[PDB]
JSON list of C-alpha atoms in Angstrom, two decimals:
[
{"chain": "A", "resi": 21, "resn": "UNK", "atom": "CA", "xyz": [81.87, 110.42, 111.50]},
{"chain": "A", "resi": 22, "resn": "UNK", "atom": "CA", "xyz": [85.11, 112.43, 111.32]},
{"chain": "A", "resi": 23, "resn": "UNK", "atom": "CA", "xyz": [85.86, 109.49, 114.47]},
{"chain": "A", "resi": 24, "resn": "UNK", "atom": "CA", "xyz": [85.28, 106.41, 112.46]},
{"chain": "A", "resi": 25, "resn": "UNK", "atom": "CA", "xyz": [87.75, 107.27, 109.70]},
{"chain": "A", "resi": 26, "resn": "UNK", "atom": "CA", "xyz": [90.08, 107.47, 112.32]},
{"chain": "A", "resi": 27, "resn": "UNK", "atom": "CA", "xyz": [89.26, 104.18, 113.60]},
{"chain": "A", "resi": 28, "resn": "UNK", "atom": "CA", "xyz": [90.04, 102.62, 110.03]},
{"chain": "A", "resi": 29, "resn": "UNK", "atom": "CA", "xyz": [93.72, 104.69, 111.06]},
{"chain": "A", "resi": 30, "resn": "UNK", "atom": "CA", "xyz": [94.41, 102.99, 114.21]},
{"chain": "A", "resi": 31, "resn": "UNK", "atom": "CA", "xyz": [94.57, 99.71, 112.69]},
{"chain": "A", "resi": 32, "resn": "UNK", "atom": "CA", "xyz": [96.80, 101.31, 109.75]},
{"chain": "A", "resi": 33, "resn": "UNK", "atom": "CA", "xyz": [98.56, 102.76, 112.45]},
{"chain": "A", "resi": 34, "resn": "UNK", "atom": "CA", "xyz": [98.69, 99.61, 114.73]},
{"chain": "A", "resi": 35, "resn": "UNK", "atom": "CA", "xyz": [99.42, 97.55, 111.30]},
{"chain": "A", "resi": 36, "resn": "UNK", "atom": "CA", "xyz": [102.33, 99.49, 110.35]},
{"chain": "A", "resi": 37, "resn": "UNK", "atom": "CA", "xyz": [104.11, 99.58, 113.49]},
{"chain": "A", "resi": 38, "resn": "UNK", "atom": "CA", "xyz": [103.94, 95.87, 113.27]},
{"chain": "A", "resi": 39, "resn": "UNK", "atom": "CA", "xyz": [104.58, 96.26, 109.99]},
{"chain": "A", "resi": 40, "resn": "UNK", "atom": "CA", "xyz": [108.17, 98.10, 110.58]},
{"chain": "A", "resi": 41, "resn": "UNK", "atom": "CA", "xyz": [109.88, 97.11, 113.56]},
{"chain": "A", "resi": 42, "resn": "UNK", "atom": "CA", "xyz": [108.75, 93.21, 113.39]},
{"chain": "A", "resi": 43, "resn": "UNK", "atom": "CA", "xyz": [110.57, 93.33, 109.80]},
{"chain": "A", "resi": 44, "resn": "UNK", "atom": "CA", "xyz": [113.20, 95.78, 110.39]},
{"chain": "A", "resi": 45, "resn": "UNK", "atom": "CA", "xyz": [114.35, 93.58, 113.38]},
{"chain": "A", "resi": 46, "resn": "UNK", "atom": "CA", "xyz": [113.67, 90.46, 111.34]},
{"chain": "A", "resi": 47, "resn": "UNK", "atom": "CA", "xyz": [115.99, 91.91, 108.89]},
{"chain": "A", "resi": 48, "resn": "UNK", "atom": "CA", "xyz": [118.79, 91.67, 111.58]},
{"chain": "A", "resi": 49, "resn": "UNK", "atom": "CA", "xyz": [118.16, 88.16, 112.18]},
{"chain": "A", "resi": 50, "resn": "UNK", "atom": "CA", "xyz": [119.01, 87.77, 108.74]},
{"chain": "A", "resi": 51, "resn": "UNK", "atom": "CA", "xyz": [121.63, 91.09, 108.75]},
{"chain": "A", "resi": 52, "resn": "UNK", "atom": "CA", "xyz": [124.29, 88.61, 111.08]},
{"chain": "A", "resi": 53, "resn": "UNK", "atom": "CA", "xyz": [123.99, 85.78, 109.03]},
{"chain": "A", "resi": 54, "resn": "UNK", "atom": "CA", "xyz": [125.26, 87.00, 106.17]},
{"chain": "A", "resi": 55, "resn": "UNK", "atom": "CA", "xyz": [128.56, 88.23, 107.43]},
{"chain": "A", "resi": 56, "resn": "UNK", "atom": "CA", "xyz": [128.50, 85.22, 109.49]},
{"chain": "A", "resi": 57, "resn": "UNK", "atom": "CA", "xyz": [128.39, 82.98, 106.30]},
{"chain": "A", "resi": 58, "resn": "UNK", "atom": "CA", "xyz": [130.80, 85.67, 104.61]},
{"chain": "A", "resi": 59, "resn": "UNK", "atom": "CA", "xyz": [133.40, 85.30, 107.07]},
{"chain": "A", "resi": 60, "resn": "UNK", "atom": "CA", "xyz": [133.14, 81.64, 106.70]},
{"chain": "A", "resi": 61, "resn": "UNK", "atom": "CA", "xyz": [133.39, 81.80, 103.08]},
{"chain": "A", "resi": 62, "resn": "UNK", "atom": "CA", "xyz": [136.58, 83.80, 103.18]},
{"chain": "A", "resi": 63, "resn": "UNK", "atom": "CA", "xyz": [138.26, 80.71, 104.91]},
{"chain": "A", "resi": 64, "resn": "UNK", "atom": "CA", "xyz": [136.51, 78.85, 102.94]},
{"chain": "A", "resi": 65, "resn": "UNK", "atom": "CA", "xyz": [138.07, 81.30, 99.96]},
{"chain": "A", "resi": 66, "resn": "UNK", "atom": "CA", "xyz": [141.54, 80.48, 100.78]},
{"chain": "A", "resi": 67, "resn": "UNK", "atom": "CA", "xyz": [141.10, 76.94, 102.52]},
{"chain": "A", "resi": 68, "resn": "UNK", "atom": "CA", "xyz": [141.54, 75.56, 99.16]},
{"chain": "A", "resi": 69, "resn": "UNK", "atom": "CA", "xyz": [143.36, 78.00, 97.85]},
{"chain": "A", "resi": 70, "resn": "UNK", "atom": "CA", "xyz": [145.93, 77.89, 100.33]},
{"chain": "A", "resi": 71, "resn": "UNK", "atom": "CA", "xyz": [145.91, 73.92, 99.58]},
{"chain": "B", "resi": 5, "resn": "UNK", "atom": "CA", "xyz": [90.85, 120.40, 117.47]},
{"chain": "B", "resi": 6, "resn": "UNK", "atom": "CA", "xyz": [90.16, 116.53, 116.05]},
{"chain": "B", "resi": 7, "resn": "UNK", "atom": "CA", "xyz": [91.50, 118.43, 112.74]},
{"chain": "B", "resi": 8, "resn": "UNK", "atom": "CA", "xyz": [95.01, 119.03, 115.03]},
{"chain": "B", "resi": 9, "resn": "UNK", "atom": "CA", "xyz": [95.82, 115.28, 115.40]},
{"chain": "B", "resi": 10, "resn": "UNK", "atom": "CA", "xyz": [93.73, 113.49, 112.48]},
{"chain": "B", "resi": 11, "resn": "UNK", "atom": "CA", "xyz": [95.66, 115.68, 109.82]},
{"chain": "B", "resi": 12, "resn": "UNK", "atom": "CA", "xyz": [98.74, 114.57, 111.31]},
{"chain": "B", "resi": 13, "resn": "UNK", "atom": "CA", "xyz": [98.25, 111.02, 112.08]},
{"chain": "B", "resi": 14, "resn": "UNK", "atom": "CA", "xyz": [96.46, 110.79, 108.63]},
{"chain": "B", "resi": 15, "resn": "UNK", "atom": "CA", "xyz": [99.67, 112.52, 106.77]},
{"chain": "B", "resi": 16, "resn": "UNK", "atom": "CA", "xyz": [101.48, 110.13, 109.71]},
{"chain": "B", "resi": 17, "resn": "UNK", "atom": "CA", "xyz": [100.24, 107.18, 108.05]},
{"chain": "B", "resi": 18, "resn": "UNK", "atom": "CA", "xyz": [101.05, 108.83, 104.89]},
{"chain": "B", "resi": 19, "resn": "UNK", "atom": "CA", "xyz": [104.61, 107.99, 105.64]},
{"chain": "B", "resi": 20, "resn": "UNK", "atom": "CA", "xyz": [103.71, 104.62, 106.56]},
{"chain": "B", "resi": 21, "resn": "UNK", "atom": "CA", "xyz": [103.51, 103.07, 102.89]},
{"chain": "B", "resi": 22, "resn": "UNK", "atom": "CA", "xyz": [106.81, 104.67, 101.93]},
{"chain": "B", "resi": 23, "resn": "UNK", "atom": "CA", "xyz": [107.97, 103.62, 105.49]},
{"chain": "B", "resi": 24, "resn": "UNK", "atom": "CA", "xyz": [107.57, 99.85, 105.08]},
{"chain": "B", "resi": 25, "resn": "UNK", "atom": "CA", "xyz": [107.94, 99.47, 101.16]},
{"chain": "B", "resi": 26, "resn": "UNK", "atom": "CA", "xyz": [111.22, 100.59, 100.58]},
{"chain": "B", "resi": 27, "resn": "UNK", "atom": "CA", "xyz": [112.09, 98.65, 103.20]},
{"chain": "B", "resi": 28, "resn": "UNK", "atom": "CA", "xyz": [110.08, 96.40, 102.02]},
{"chain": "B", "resi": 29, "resn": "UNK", "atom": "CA", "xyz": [111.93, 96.93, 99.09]},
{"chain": "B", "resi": 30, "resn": "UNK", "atom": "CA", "xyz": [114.72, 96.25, 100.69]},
{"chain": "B", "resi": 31, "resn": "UNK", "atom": "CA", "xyz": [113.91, 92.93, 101.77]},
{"chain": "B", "resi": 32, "resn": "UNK", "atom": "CA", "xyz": [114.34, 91.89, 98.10]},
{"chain": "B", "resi": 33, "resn": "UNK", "atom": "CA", "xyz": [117.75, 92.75, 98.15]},
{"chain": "B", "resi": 34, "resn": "UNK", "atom": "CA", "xyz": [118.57, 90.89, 100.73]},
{"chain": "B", "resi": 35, "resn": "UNK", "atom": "CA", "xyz": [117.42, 87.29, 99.29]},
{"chain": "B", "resi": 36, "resn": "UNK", "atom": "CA", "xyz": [119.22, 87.72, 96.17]},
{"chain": "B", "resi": 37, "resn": "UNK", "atom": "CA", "xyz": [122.84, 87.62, 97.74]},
{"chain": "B", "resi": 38, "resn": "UNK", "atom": "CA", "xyz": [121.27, 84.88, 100.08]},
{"chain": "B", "resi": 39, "resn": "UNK", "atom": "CA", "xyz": [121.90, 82.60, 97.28]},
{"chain": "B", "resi": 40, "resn": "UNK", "atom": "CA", "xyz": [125.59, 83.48, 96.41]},
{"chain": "B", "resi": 41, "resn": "UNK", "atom": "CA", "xyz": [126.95, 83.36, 99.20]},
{"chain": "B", "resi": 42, "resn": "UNK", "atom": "CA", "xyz": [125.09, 80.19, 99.73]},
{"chain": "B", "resi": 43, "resn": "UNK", "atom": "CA", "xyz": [125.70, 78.78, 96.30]},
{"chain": "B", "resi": 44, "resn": "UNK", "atom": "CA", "xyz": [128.85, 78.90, 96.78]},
{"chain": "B", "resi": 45, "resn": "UNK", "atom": "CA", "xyz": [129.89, 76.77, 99.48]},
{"chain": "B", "resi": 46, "resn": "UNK", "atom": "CA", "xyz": [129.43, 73.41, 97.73]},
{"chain": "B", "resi": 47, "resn": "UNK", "atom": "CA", "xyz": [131.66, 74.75, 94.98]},
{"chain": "B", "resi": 48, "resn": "UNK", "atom": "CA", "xyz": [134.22, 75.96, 97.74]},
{"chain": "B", "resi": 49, "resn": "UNK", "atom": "CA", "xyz": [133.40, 72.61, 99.43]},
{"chain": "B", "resi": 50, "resn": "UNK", "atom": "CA", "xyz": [134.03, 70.21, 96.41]},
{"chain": "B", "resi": 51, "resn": "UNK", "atom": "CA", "xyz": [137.29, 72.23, 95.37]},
{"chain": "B", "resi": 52, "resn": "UNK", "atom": "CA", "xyz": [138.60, 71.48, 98.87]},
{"chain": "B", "resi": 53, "resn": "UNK", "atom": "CA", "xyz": [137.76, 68.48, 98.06]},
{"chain": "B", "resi": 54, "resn": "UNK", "atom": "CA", "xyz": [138.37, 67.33, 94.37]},
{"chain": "B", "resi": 55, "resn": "UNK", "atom": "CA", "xyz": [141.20, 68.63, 94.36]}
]
């Protein structure tokens, strides 16, 4: 009995660990972007306002 | 000896909700700055380009 509680733990346990890395690593995907956009924009900053 | 590891996978999980939801939190503060950055091109394009 003290076993099946811990079976309602694996899943929170194999739920979370999908939970964090698959998100955490997402978050990446979107981390590079934004500098990648950011260093566009700061050409894009000047581009104009160096014409 | 189950009380060994259930304890500390059960106070293991206990991390778990504060693990994903402040990153979770986090993933709030990424879409908000999506936006600007993204907002802003069309401006920075049409100034390039009305002017």
């Amino acid at each position: 009995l003290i076993q099946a509680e811990e079976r309602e733990v694996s899943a929170r346990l194999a739920a979370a660990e999908t939970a964090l890395g698959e998100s955490d690593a997402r978050r990446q995907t979107q981390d590079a972007a934004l500098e990648d956009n950011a260093l566009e924009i700061d050409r894009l900053r000047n581009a104009l306002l160096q014409s």
